[PDB]
Each structure stands twice: as C-alpha cells, then as structure tokens.
RNA sequence: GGCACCUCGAUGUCGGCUCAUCGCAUCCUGGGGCUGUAGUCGGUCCCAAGGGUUGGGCUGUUCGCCCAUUAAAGCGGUACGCGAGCUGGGUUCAGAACGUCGUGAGACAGUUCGGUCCCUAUCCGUCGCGGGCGCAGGAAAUUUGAGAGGAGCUGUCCUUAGUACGAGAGGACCGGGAUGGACGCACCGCUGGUGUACCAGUUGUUCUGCCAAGGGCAUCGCUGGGUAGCUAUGUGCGGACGGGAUAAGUGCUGAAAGCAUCUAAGCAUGAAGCCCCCCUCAAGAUGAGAUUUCCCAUUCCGCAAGGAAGUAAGAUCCCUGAAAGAUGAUCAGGUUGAUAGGUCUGAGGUGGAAGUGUGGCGACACAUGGAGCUGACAGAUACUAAUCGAUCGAGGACUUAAC
C-alpha cells in the first residue's frame, strides 16, 4: 500500500504536490530513498495528464501542481511547461519517465538518499 | 478475475431488463408453500446496487399496511421470473438509504416519473 | 438480532401498546433472537381497552425485526419496525388480528395458524 | 485417499438444482504428478509425493532436477505426501486431473492460515476487553498470570503474540461442481489461507 | 520497575554480543572506485552502470 | 478460635473487573446397585473431574432474597487466587454533621457527605521470533513421530407410540431421524462495520488578475456512499463414526466348607474416566532418525599428526517486493525477465465531469454522454527500478564384522 512517511494526511498531499512542482523547474532532485520510491508513482501520473492536451486535463494539473514560475524571462507557469516541453519530449515513450538512482546515506541522521530525475 | 468470470458466465441471466437504481420495478417470485407455488408480486424502489457478478444484489423496498419492508433480491437468482419497471425516477445519488425515513409524500418526490 | 432490555412495539389487538423483552428461552443461552423465537416479556404500555394490562409478564413470539433475516435462497428481509404478538401457554395468539406484514419464517415452524391471520406474508 | 493440492484464486457463489445460495471456493488443483512412491518395506511407510505448479529450470536446483528425472517430469515446486493412499493406486509418473473427485464426496481441507501479523490476546484468544470507563486504566491487557503460591507463571498461559501462518485443518467441506477441462475444484464453505496460497484437498474421513 | 540487583559483567558482555552492527557489503567500481556498496551511486566518480550522473 | 514461631528499617486490607488452574464430599451429563421404584417423576448409596457450569433487580458487600431462565445454574484450595494488571465503592488519615457518652478537650465494629492507589522489567518465569554450534563429508528436499498441546458440553422436535404400563389421569425404556444453544477453528463471496492520497454534494474565508473551473484551512471542515485490506453481529466447518484394557455393577464355570458361592484358579460383560481414533507443534527424541535426489573425491605445507588457499552442489551479502512482517526470519523474484511502479485493457466504487449548445428574467434545468473521476483489485506490456559484482561453502576420523 501507499507509504505514510509519518506525516499528517493533509500534509501528505501538500508534501507530494510540492515535490511535483520542484521537479518541473529543477528537472532533477535528490531526496531520501524511501520518499523517492513513493515519489515516482505520483509524478508520472501527472505527465500522463499532459499528454492529451485537453483543457479539462490542464485544470486537473492545477489540483496538484502549484502556481509557481518556471523558466526565467519565458514566465511559463509550472503547469504550462508540461504541456509545452515535457509532453512533446515523451510523445513516443509510455511510462518509465522517472528513473531513481540510489545514493549513499546522509551524514545528518543516517537517512539513505536517492537521485530523482526524468528520463 | 478472468477465470472467475469464466465460471459466472454459465449462470449468467441475460434475460433480465436493464434498469436504473431509482425505479419501481416489480419482481416476481415463486413461493413453495407446498406443493403449489404462489406468485407474490412485490413493487418497490430499488436502492443498493452492489457489484460482483453473480453476487450482485439490489434492495427493493415497499411500505405495506403502514409499515415498510426491505426484501433484497440478488440480481442473478433463479427464483426471479420477470421484472417490470412501472416507473423511472431521477436520482442525484446511487444509495438512496434516506428515503425510508421520509414518509410519506416526501418519498414520492424522489419517485418522479421519467 | 435482539438484545436483552429491548422494547418491542405490539403488532396485534392484545390491547398492549409496547412490550419490553425479559430473556430468550433458547438455551442457557442465546441473547440474540431473529424470528419465530419465543421470549418472555413485560408490557411497559397498553391501550385502555384490552385484556392486557401494564406490567404483566407474558411470553411473545417475534414477528418482525429491523435486522436482515437470512434465508437459504439468499433473500433477506428487514422491517422498519420490530414487532411481536402476545401468546400464553398454547401458541394461539391473544390478538384478534395482526397489523402489518408477517415474515414467512414462521411458516416452516408449526406456527402456521398465526400466519393465517396475517393480511400479507413476505 | 487422494488429494490434488492447488492454489485458490477467488471466492465465488454458485447455485444449482435447488434455488438455495451456495458459497464456493475456486481451486487450481490439477495437474499433479507422482514424483515418487514410498514403500513400507524400504521407506518404512506408504505415501505419494505429489507435486504442484511446474516451473522454469532457472529457479530449479540441480539436485531438484534429478529428483524429477526419475518421474519423467519437468522440475516442480511444492511436494506433499498423503497417507494413506490405497496402493498400488497409480503407476509411477501418471498424471492426475480432478477425475477422482465427484460432487457428492465429502472433503477435508488443510493449509497455511492467512497471517494476521503480531496481535493482542483479544484477537489471538478471544479474551474479553476490560472496561473502557469508570476511571479504569485497564483494558486490552491479558491480566494476571494467576496464583502467587507457585511463584511462577504457568506454562501455556495465554499471552499476546503473532498469529497465523500456521497450518490449520478444516474438516468435512463439500464439493459443489467439477470442471476437469479447466481443472477447477468448487468446494462449498470457507477455505483457510491467503489468496493464491497453496491448499491441500485431502479426502475426508468416513464414515 | 526497579531492578533488584546490579548486573554482572558476564551477563552485560553477553548482552553486548549481539549489539554490534554488521559490516555493509561492498563492491569495486566498474569504472574506478574504490569502492562502492551495491545498488547505490558512489560518492566518488558518481558513475552508475556506467552512466555519469551527479 | 486458641498459641505469638514468618514479617511492625513496611507481607498494601474487603468486594469486583480480569484471566485462571487445582482438589473432590459430583449441580448437570454418561455407568449403575437398592427403593415406601406401576409408568412418569423422584429418594438413597456406590463409578466417575472429561466437559459444561446464568442474565438481571436490592446492597460497597461476600452471603442472602427476588425475577426470568437453563441438562444444571456444585463447594472449596491457590498469601479468605490475582492492586510492580485495574477498579476505590466498603473500612482504615486529615474536613464536616446527627444521635449518644464526657464539666471539658474529644470519643463511639453507630450512621451520613467529600477525599493525589507511585514505579522505564535486571534475573528467574511464561507468549512469540532469530543469531551460533552440534548431529564424524557438504547440500536441496520430503517426512517417520519418542514426546507435547488442543479439541472432550448438550437442548428440543419427528418416529417406534399413544405401544409396553396404568380403572383412569398420565406416559416411556431401547433403536433411528432432523433442527438449535454455548464454545472452538477458519474465510468474505453474500449481510454489513471501518475505510485520512477514492468519488460526490455543500458552508465560511482566503489564495489562482477577474469569470467558469479549483486549491489551502476550519475534527478527513461538514455531510452522503465505497475498492482493497482488516473484520463479526455474517458465512462455512468442528466435537463424527469406532476399537484396547478397565471402574462401580452384571456374570458364567466350580473349590477351600461333598451342598452352596463373581474369585481364591480359569473365562466374560460393562461408563461423557483412562489409552488411541480426530487436529496441531515436533530428531537440540546430543537416542540428534529414515528415505529421495545432487557435488566430487582438489590445489599448497608439514616425512607422520595436522593446518591453510580456491572451488563444486548449494547459499548469502545487495536489490524489486509481498500471500509475510516490530526487527530478523518466511515466501514470490533478480534481465532466455511480469518482482514492484508506470503505461494500456477491465472489474469494482462514486455516479451524469469539463467544455459547448439549447430553454428560462434569474436561480437552474436539459442535451451532447452510463459521461467523467479513480488509493492499494485483476489481465498483459521491459516503458522504468531489480545494476556491476563480491562473500560463505565439501576433500569424507579411527575400529570391528559381513563382503
């Protein structure tokens, strides 16, 4: 089943929605190994929403992805990049969009880390 | 459950009419009082529509002599003979549990003809 | 499904209005009671005109239950209101008539004479 | 006494002849093969080591590959004896496919129970809960070990612990229907175990 | 829950027998190393079968 | 009760809630001898602890009384069983009163109202799970079962029968047939319960520039349903059918006492007891078993004894995980690949989404359309992550006999 992370359930939605937005701008992010495994299930579904290009589908992205600015000067919304950049790049591929390499444990509390990036 | 679907297919009853959860259909049920089987007609509004192949069931309900009756009928049981939907009814939901407490004209408001 | 200390409204012209349960006669034993079970009971309330009077201790057979009764056919029945008919020694009901629907579960038992007084059987 | 053990897949309802509803458990059952035949004059007892669910050679150990070589059969997973088969019963290596079991036969069922995980005594043994009110701190806990005089806990005294995952017999279950073409068993009544777990189908004691 | 007596050094060390952590497994890198524990990116070159991602 | 040998540098009282177990002078059930035993129903004395042992009203109570039941609602031991498990209601602190006694101060197995019940388990104990070594070579498996535990209770109706019996009234023994209670073991497919990343409706405020359409918060804001999993109040099953020797009894042959006599010789019959049949753990049953199938009989030292370095069968470290799970362990798997996630197709759930058009002053309604949305449930699909590698791991001891 879905991992809890120990967070309050209301926090859990925001905790996932924040990571989905930060991946859009940064393209890649390093977090804990366990949170990383949970992360791939949510983000890849969001990419599927951007495939159809439907106006209704874009509103669904608003339910998760927050209104944060992406690229500088272009002033694209974080939602907009998925419908303009990521979608065209994966028109051929179907799933497997987010590989997650493992990384050594953090010194600050022994927590294992893992890279998260689109591919 | 493709294998499970293969077993249920033999007992499937395609003869039954399609119907919305909110309607006053009249199931016929033979009753073996012994030896002759009486046919007791039973009109009423369906509520629950649980899924699960042969295990599917629906809860027809009817007030009788000032008191209601909740006689559940499984969808694919042999005992059913014929079903006649006397009236269709608009429903904002799927589980109309509330109507039983809303005697009596108020229940009719959810029973509007379609 | 009926527990001890459970008031059950009258279903016949015994003159009683409401009838609290005392104890199931089944076994040491069962607390639960579906339909057709005999249970000793107190008459908490009664209509002014009738043989029954308040506080009398008389047995009564269950007629209707809010709980969904089970059948081998898989059909289930659950009345909006619980009910019982008053009976003493011989199982002929004290009530001249029985209001409302009556469960068929009584019929399998040799209680069939009670079924005859029923306006309808479901 | 025969027993074609096999994994259950899903619960099903099945009505037939009579209009009464009959709960039914699916069982994969067949095929099964006699990997070996025990002899009392050598092995010291009568038994047949039936297997179930053949698998690829990659998962098979070399010694396991030799054990099935005598059976003239591909390597296969779980193996169980079923005392006491009526010898000679079958020739070595003969296939079996639900042919023995008729719908009218009564059938005992045994298999590993579904894991409930580590649990308290109330689930493990059905002990009554303590009061939740009237200022009582006590509830759920097993309670006193017993008498002070022995100056020791009695062995076998109930305590909370892990439950399930142990083999548990369920006697006198009845078969409803037979589907040899699909190798399906249709036994009436609940059958113990987790979904897709192995389940023996030994003949019931009679009479 | 007050203990009745101080523990002996024997029982203490016997309790210490299982307390020790096990050594993590390790493998030489295909590229350089050394070394790298299985199924996690090295902190050195950062190579991963055998792609270089930092 | 008596005595003052345990404890006044602490043995925490009574009654309950909890869980028990033990002993029989046995409440019930099963086996009977004698009856002022017609039958029915009882009385009494012997076998028997296997099992079962009630829901409430009164009282802090035990006890007792009462009500409704039950085959019966038996006693007692275990620090008048159990407070490092709980309850403070009763006594047994400090407050306050009544009655009575005392000049008073106060007192009263007289009564009434209120009144902090502390504690991280070291060891022995018990309920579960591992890490080591042994089992004269290493392994993968399957099991024999010395021993141990669990299960062990019964009601009604339908027959023989309205027969045996009795003037009647009443009404069986025995042998069969069905349906329940109590309890136990399992599973969700029905009945439902829950279900915090599922669906829908809806309130206030705020954030997306404003609309439409949403987000945040307010117990998951609230409300209505629900997949899976977990669950009983749900379902299915269980105590069945029989043997071995017996207990009290019933005896058959016959002596010591020519008759007689259950026994002293010899043979029977006979119980929910005991032993097994039933189910479960089990060769650390150091007595370490048995059978099936694999690896080979190395390379280096030391003349010998013996010790090292690799490897084979196999296994592990690590990793994808769940039918498992506190952690280990267990099971499904590790690229001639479906282990998990994703992607498609379904099942189930919630149910007429957005957009657009139309009707209506508006609010909304209808159509497009069983649409839309879908967390764990399935079927395929390498699209991703289970890389790359490492480690552990046997050369079969010495005798005797049969060959």
Short mmCIF file of C-alpha atoms in Angstrom, two decimals, chain C residues 3-4 13 17 19 21 25 29 33 37 42 44 58 60 64 67 83 87 91 95 104 106 109 115:
data_model
loop_
_atom_site.label_atom_id
_atom_site.label_comp_id
_atom_site.label_asym_id
_atom_site.label_seq_id
_atom_site.Cartn_x
_atom_site.Cartn_y
_atom_site.Cartn_z
CA UNK C 3 -30.54 -7.97 22.89
CA UNK C 4 -31.88 -8.16 26.46
CA UNK C 13 -55.05 -6.42 19.13
CA UNK C 17 -49.02 -0.80 23.17
CA UNK C 19 -43.66 -4.64 25.23
CA UNK C 21 -38.16 -8.10 26.48
CA UNK C 25 -35.95 -19.07 26.21
CA UNK C 29 -28.15 -19.26 26.30
CA UNK C 33 -33.19 -13.55 18.58
CA UNK C 37 -38.11 -17.25 18.78
CA UNK C 42 -43.10 -7.26 30.11
CA UNK C 44 -44.48 -1.40 29.52
CA UNK C 58 -46.35 -12.74 29.30
CA UNK C 60 -44.46 -13.29 22.99
CA UNK C 64 -40.75 -8.54 12.67
CA UNK C 67 -32.23 -6.86 11.38
CA UNK C 83 -42.76 -6.41 16.47
CA UNK C 87 -49.08 -15.55 23.49
CA UNK C 91 -49.48 -20.79 20.85
CA UNK C 95 -54.55 -10.85 19.35
CA UNK C 104 -42.62 -16.32 6.13
CA UNK C 106 -42.83 -18.59 10.92
CA UNK C 109 -42.31 -23.85 12.10
CA UNK C 115 -49.82 -17.00 9.53
#
